[PDB]
Structures are given as structure tokens and as C-alpha cells.
Structure 1
């Protein structure tokens, strides 16, 4: 089930590379590797979810990041089925602070979505049409998952604040609550709602997301079927 399944092979993050605030989240250093306790998970996986249900109902919004490939393609699908924004490829500065300013790149799509139907293809000639294609392509690609926010979020969900603190400290200046999955390499002082564990365990990912999104759907109504991401493993 929860930790029952998790208790399988989905913990323990690296070895002799850590930031000594995970002291209250580590069982033992047995056999060289560092191992994260799971009694504390439940004692921390609750309060997290518990106060999502205080926020998931009142129309709050959530952000999913994942500039690590072994989570990039996962956040992807698990974000649409969630219906909440996401930044799969790579995050870049300002998104939450320069919300107005980043949006012009998104609004651009509106002034670019006019084209692919409207009678200016016959007007707008090719040499800039062609070389704007990839521009439109790479504009959508890096920004799909942000093309659906004009209101600024109500949360942040991060696979690894060590990898994505750059997208956290932005939220931190906005007094916007920040949640994140944390590993032995993390820094569990800046995260508001802690979800410790191995973030680079490809396995310890897919199950985290549905179980995270299951609350999203259950907040909205009618849990469904996710995606058997096991094929994305080996």
C-alpha cells in the first residue's frame, strides 16, 4: 500500500554526502550507504496531505517541477492527469517573481496561436514562418505546463530542493507555501511540507505521484487510472 509498498526498494539516498538536518530522518548508516527511516515518513507524510485537503478543496493551485530526466518524463504525464502546472524540461529564473514578465512569452502563444488557421499563412511568408516554427515549438515545449496559469500558484512541489531550490527561494519571497520531496542531499528547513525519500530512485517516483495525485482527484472527485510507468524503468 503506502509505506508497505515503499518499504520495498524505494529509500536510501547516496552515501557520505548529506546536509546534517536529515538527522531526524535517518535510521542507520549500515553497510556504508545512508538509509532513511520510514517511521518518520508516515509521521511526516500525514501532515503534508492533511493540509493539502485544507487547501486542495478551496481551489488552490499546485506546481510540479522536474528538471531531472529520471523524473522529467514522469512529472509530465502525472501533471496533465493532475491538471496542475508543471515545468518538465528546465526551470529558469523569474517564473514566480516575474509572473507578469514571463507571461509575455506565454501570451506570445496567443498572438502565435492566431496563425495556424487564420488567413495570414497566405500573408506571412515562409522564411520567417519556417524559422518561427521551431521558435513556436521550443516556446511551447519549454513552457507547456506553464501555458495554464494566469493567476500565480498556491503551492510548489519539488522532486529535489537540492536540484530545484532556485525555483523555491523565488516562492519563498512570495510567502507561497512550498512542498517538496527531499533526499539525504536536501535541506529540510526551507521546505514547508516535508516528503523525505530517495528522489533519484526512479521507482520511488511513479508511486509517489499517483498517490499524490489521488488526493488531487479525490479532492476534485473520482479517482482514476494513472500510467504504468514501470516501462519507463528498465
Structure 2
């Protein structure tokens, strides 16, 4: 499944902007791109997906992060299929040191959902209502998937290794094992259980996250059908 479908439509990318460690898990650099050695790909696939199966049988919280449009679409629906919080929006620097900040916004969000369905409609002048609508769409858009993150999330899949090494940075400081994906440019060793690949290829990520959902379901149950991407994959 993996190696076959993988090579068939995806592997490496970027243009000699690479990272050292990358090169060791990689064959070639040829033409202008670094070519994913699918072997050890599948090796750490074994490590990581072992983890996945295990604590999917137990139950935990990991991210679907793609602050970039690409991944974004896919992961969002993946969340609305897997169950955990996701960060498609700009992951903000604060959560993993300022849990209380977010939790303030969050309890307040409970109260916001509350006062939405309330006789406070006609009351409190029109423009004011407009303002409250605006804060609504704020916390709504950003805290799209992530809204049900109660407790601490124990590992954090996520894509592109740079910005999402800012994400890595927070998780990493608060002693949290990183699962995550990377292309050519940035480093994987700040991650314990990495994933090399093409964070510019759409089919790659889709296959990965979709069958990873079906990995939690390989430990959970209910195996249905893959909808995300496909149509949105090449248009």
C-alpha cells in the first residue's frame, strides 16, 4: 500500500534549500530535488503508526495542522472524521505556556454560544450586536477544529517543517513527543518520530492523513470511505 501508492504520485521537493538530516533519509538531489528513500520512510512509518495504533486503542489528542491553504482543506475534514482538534488557521504563539489565555477565550466561548441563543437580540444596540458577531467569527475561524481540546494534547502531527517548527518549538519545550511531516528545507531531529516527504504535494498528504485516520480506526473501528481531496486535488 504505502510504498506503491507513495512513489506513484509523490516523494520529495524544494530546490537545494535542504536540511542535513534530510539528506541521510534521502537518495538524490538530482535535477533540483531530493528524492525520498521510501524504505526508511516505511521504517519510521512502522514506528510512528505503531504509536498511532496503540494510543488510538487507548484514546488521546494530536493535531491536524496545516496553517497553509493546501493541507488546510484536507486536514479540516480529516478532523471532522478523526475527532481531534486541528489548526488550519495561524497557530498562535502562546497555547503551550499560556494554557490559561486560550482557556479564558474558550470558557468565554461557551458563554458566547450561550448568549447567541438568548433574548439579548433586540436588546443591546445593533452595532454592538455587529461587534459580538465579529468576535464570533474570530474565535470561530481560528478555533475551528481546536475547540474541544480539553486537557493536554500529547503529540502533534502537522505539516511543513519551518513555520510548523514554530509549532514544533512550543510542543518541544513543554516536553511533548513530536509526530509531524517535513519537506527538504528544515530539520527533523527536533522531532522524535518524523515523517519525510513533499509538503507541496496534495495527494501525498491526503493519502497519509486519510489512512492515518483509518489507522485510528484500525485501532478503533467503523471503516467507512475516503472523501477528502480527490476532486479538490488538481483543479
- In the alignment, structure 1 segments of 5+ residues that lack a partner are none
Asked if the contact 1:13/1:197 (under 8 Å) is kept, the reply is yes
Q: Which has the higher helix share?
A: 2
Q: CA RMSD in A?
A: 1.5
SS at match of 2:76: helix
TM-score, normalised by the number of residues in structure 1: 0.94
SS at match of 2:116: coil
SS at match of 1:115: helix
- In structure 1, C-alpha distance between the alignment counterparts of 2:145 and 2:86, rounded to whole Å: 4
Structure 1 residues 51 and 129, CA gap change in structure 2 (3 angstroms): same
Asked if the contact 1:85/1:146 (under 8 Å) is kept, the reply is yes
Asked if the contact 2:14/2:32 (under 8 Å) is kept, the reply is no
- In the alignment, structure 2 segments of 5+ residues that lack a partner are none
Structure 1 residues 29 and 125, CA gap change in structure 2 (3 angstroms): same
Aligned counterpart, 2:5: 5
Asked if the contact 1:188/1:194 (under 8 Å) is kept, the reply is yes
Structure 1 residue 228, shift from structure 2 partner: 4.4
How many correspondences in the alignment? 234
Structure 1 residue 203, shift from structure 2 partner: 1.8
The Cα offsets for residues 147-201 of structure 1, whole Å up to 9 and x where unpaired, read as: 1112121111111222211111111122111110122113110111111111111
SS at match of 1:55: helix
- In structure 2, C-alpha distance between the alignment counterparts of 1:141 and 1:31, rounded to whole Å: 40
Asked if the contact 1:22/1:188 (under 8 Å) is kept, the reply is yes
SS at match of 2:151: coil
The Cα offsets for residues 40-71 of structure 1, whole Å up to 9 and x where unpaired, read as: 11112111101222322222211121111111
Alignment of 1:110 with 2:97, yes or no, is no
Structure 1 residue 88, shift from structure 2 partner: 0.7
Asked if the contact 1:115/1:121 (under 8 Å) is kept, the reply is no
